Design a protein around this ligand. Sequence first.
Ligand SMILES: Nc1ncnc2c1ncn2[C@@H]1O[C@H](COP(=O)(O)OP(=O)(O)NP(=O)(O)O)[C@@H](O)[C@H]1O
Ligand SMILES: Nc1ncnc2c1ncn2[C@@H]1O[C@H](COP(=O)(O)OP(=O)(O)NP(=O)(O)O)[C@@H](O)[C@H]1O
Ligand SMILES: Cc1ncc(C[n+]2csc(CCOP(=O)(O)O)c2C)c(N)n1
Ligand SMILES: Cc1ncc(C[n+]2csc(CCOP(=O)(O)O)c2C)c(N)n1
Ligand SMILES: [K+]
Ligand SMILES: [K+]
Ligand SMILES: [K+]
Ligand SMILES: [K+]
Ligand SMILES: [K+]
Ligand SMILES: [K+]
Ligand SMILES: [Mg+2]
Ligand SMILES: [Mg+2]
Ligand SMILES: [Mg+2]
Ligand SMILES: [Mg+2]
Ligand SMILES: [Mg+2]
Ligand SMILES: [Mg+2]
Ligand SMILES: [Mg+2]
Ligand SMILES: [Mg+2]
Lengths: 305, 305
Amino acid sequence: MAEFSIIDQYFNRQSHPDVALGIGDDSALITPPPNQQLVICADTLVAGRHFPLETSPHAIGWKSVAVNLSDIAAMGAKPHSILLAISLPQVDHEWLEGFSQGIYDCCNQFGVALIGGDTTQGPHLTITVTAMGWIETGKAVLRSGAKVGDYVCVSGQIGDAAYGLQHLGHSLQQRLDYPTPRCKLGEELKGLASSMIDVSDGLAQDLGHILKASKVGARLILEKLPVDPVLQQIEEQQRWQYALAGGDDYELCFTITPQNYEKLLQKQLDVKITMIGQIVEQTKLTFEHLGSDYPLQIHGYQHFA
Amino acid sequence: MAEFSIIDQYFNRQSHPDVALGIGDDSALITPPPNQQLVICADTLVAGRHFPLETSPHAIGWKSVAVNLSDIAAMGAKPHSILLAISLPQVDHEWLEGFSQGIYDCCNQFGVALIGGDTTQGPHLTITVTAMGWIETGKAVLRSGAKVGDYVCVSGQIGDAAYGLQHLGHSLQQRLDYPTPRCKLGEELKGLASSMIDVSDGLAQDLGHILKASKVGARLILEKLPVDPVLQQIEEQQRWQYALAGGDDYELCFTITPQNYEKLLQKQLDVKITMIGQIVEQTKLTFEHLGSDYPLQIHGYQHFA
Ligand SMILES: Nc1ncnc2c1ncn2[C@@H]1O[C@H](COP(=O)(O)OP(=O)(O)NP(=O)(O)O)[C@@H](O)[C@H]1O
Ligand SMILES: Nc1ncnc2c1ncn2[C@@H]1O[C@H](COP(=O)(O)OP(=O)(O)NP(=O)(O)O)[C@@H](O)[C@H]1O
Ligand SMILES: Cc1ncc(C[n+]2csc(CCOP(=O)(O)O)c2C)c(N)n1
Ligand SMILES: Cc1ncc(C[n+]2csc(CCOP(=O)(O)O)c2C)c(N)n1
Ligand SMILES: [K+]
Ligand SMILES: [K+]
Ligand SMILES: [K+]
Ligand SMILES: [K+]
Ligand SMILES: [K+]
Ligand SMILES: [K+]
Ligand SMILES: [Mg+2]
Ligand SMILES: [Mg+2]
Ligand SMILES: [Mg+2]
Ligand SMILES: [Mg+2]
Ligand SMILES: [Mg+2]
Ligand SMILES: [Mg+2]
Ligand SMILES: [Mg+2]
Ligand SMILES: [Mg+2]
């Protein structure tokens, strides 16, 4: 069982209809759907840094795909295919069975094909997935575009995964191990959201990228943050730290005019949406709690920080 | 200095006019050229396995791009853009300056844009580049197209990089550190070559992928293998070993009819071309030396083998 048999045994299932050439050649081939731009991203997962060392192989495979689909969704785009680059310290059939099952379970959930990649030996388990999607030309939702008066919104709940990481064994570890990329919501926000980012590093810092790109600020209402009932019972200063600086949420944070927010609520969405503040002219991120200014020092996840 | 400053300092030179959305958002955007297919590949380099630990950062950056442009060329396609996923143990400005210089030197040599990527901390230096190209729809040169009677050809020289690795300091180390992706030759072989692969693992093993995909065999003439004058002066047995199983060549091995070969030889090419054998009906790779069968056992590079 060497490199090429590993690819054949675990990573070479047939794709959905729309792949001109999948695994088996030097590159993969995709015939573009008409009137669409290619949307492309890549994110790396390092064992022990992006997931606890004892994470199940299935959850490693799932999250390796999910975090990349999240960046496709963050543009308003529809995901199509992925490449899988994996560096393995050892060949372990049971690990490979579960990891590949996790890859395919995530791909199949969101209609994505695995069309290529690379397999290497390395001293440390490292995974880089490239995701490819398509969007109607010119309709991508950028990190720029937020305007004064726009609502700030976030999907789902924030802080779950960060609580789960420090409370391994708690049910909220499911949000650490199995984030849900908000694929359909991202598509439903095309033409409604004025800006958008996915929350991989922490709501405050990721919103900050929108604020900097859009040259605006924001005031967030801390008691509106959508946190789990478990986090509603912990002291508020640490509740805010999980919610705003925890990261690993893979929810969508977006801005939207009040008028377009009304339109969005009229849709049938597969995740909840919460308005948590609004965009303002002054170029600072500030916080308010129960009607008063709430000074808060927050730092999201950043490598080498 | 931390993650986001690193990206801005080293990996964020002004984006191509030909890129709809470059670095700065959750994904990159590309507007497809009309009547062309997307060609996409990704290859990982692990420090100490894909290059000597002491390899200069500039050479590491160059080769990270080059090996991926090679897989675009192996399809007959024109390279367009890359993503860069790098995992670093430490922040070293002198290393990052050289490495990013090598990334951009290779991109600029071949007209390619760096449009996105990912930056992580990890315990071991690991790089995965994704390359994107475009090709006239339907015209990709596949590993499965070889036909009985086709010539087997290879560009440049084979065995240089493998000798270089075993003789660090020798001028042939430059073929290990700075392989040349054969981009223009790949484009010139669109519509002429019946099959093609780039020689990353070893000519015999990589030719073997074509033979299996095409359900054919090949007979190669050992004294026609294009090797460096340095290898012409070493013992024959080791010469064949370097040439046929050395790997790291990043030359193009292709099959072509005699008639299309004559057309190819009338073109202005930036690399030499050698006919080294021919495709036969029996599904075996055999070798001939001085007009007699030459039994030979070689194995190319394969992880975990
Ligand atoms: N883990 C993986 N998952 C899915 N596809 C893969 C994976 N590893 C490799 N592939 C595909 O399997 C085929 C063979 O891969 P590979 O041997 O890496 O090709 P190559 O890049 O041309 N050679 P090399 O440069 O030596 O790695 C290609 O079509 C790859 O895209
Ligand atoms: N080494 C790199 N080379 C080129 N572009 C890069 C590199 N690292 C990151 N980028 C780009 O820089 C921007 C910020 O990257 P990044 O923070 O990784 O985005 P993200 O994936 O949305 N967040 P995260 O999931 O936390 O990594 C994106 O446009 C990336 O494509
Ligand atoms: C063992 C362990 N320690 C810490 C974390 C938290 N974590 C790791 S990377 C990251 C941001 C996204 O990464 P990137 O920016 O590299 O895409 C976060 C919040 C974890 N999940 N597991
Ligand atoms: C230090 C050192 N040891 C060995 C080699 C040789 N080598 C490494 S990977 C590979 C095949 C291509 O890799 P992959 O199949 O992963 O793309 C070859 C020929 C080297 N260059 N440096
Ligand atoms: K490849
Ligand atoms: K490989
Ligand atoms: K976005
Ligand atoms: K990304
Ligand atoms: K990152
Ligand atoms: K090919
Ligand atoms: Mg190849
Ligand atoms: Mg991401
Ligand atoms: Mg490869
Ligand atoms: Mg991050
Ligand atoms: Mg993102
Ligand atoms: Mg390759
Ligand atoms: Mg990233
Ligand atoms: Mg190989």
